[PDB]
């Protein structure tokens, strides 16, 4: 295997990994550890927007809000997140919105599986084709 047996939090090559105490293999999926939320792949906290058991959270780079560490979910309220070329909108509960949304008078569609805005072309949603701008805003009309 790629890793030897470790348990709990360990530092490897400049990153903190979490290994399951009962199996000594890297953690996978969402976990709250000491009141900090992470989304793991093979022990390594992932950085980005991922779906946890109460919706999409922003698992942020270190020092984004309240001195969070790499991959720790952060408070992120009532604003857009423009990450890696993709567009999200976060509500008052610090979760990314999904489906049809009206924001500042404009209509968006946030993909249910990724929370990313449909953007930059024609998208088929529930049998109907719509046009979305590069900014994720739905144009007038049917296509």
């Amino acid at each position, epitope marked *: 295997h790629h890793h030897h047996h470790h348990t709990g939090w360990v530092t490897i090559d400049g990153r903190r990994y979490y290994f399951e105490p009962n199996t000594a293999i890297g953690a996978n999926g969402y976990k709250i550890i000491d009141n900090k939320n992470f989304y793991f792949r093979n022990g390594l906290p992932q*950085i*980005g927007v991922f779906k946890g058991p109460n919706g999409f959270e922003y698992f942020a*780079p*270190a*020092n*984004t809000d309240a*001195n969070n560490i790499d991959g720790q979910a952060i408070r992120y309220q009532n*604003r*857009f*997140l*423009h*990450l*890696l*070329g993709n567009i999200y909108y976060f509500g008052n509960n610090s979760k990314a919105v999904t489906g049809w949304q009206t*924001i*500042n008078g*404009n209509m968006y569609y946030f993909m249910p599986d990724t929370a990313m805005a449909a953007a930059g072309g024609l998208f088929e949603i529930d049998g109907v084709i719509y046009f979305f701008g590069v*900014d994720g*805003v739905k144009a007038p009309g049917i296509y």
Partner: nanobody
Amino acid sequence: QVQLVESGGGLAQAGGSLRLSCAASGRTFSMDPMAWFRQPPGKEREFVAAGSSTGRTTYYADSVKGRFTISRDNAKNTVYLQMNSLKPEDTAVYYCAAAPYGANWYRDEYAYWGQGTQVTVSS
């Protein structure tokens, strides 16, 4: 703890060139768009340029299109503004910015702002 620091400003003659650098520290910006804004005397802050996380996709104010070029080096956590064919109209305090939280990158809503560097162009 996070700082954006502009350098490369100052005086220049019309038709000439300047290169601004904005060095970021305290947090990695490789996932965020980065931008330049400017504030002319008496007027409000205005959009100049913005570049995507990798640097592949760029947007420019109509005023500066063709003359100004935005680029970035993520290994250095730095964004640049190459200012060619300078005009007296370009005279302004220039600000670098990162991580927009408004609807689009043109809007003056960014999570991090530089201190600003004075640029003066003479006729």
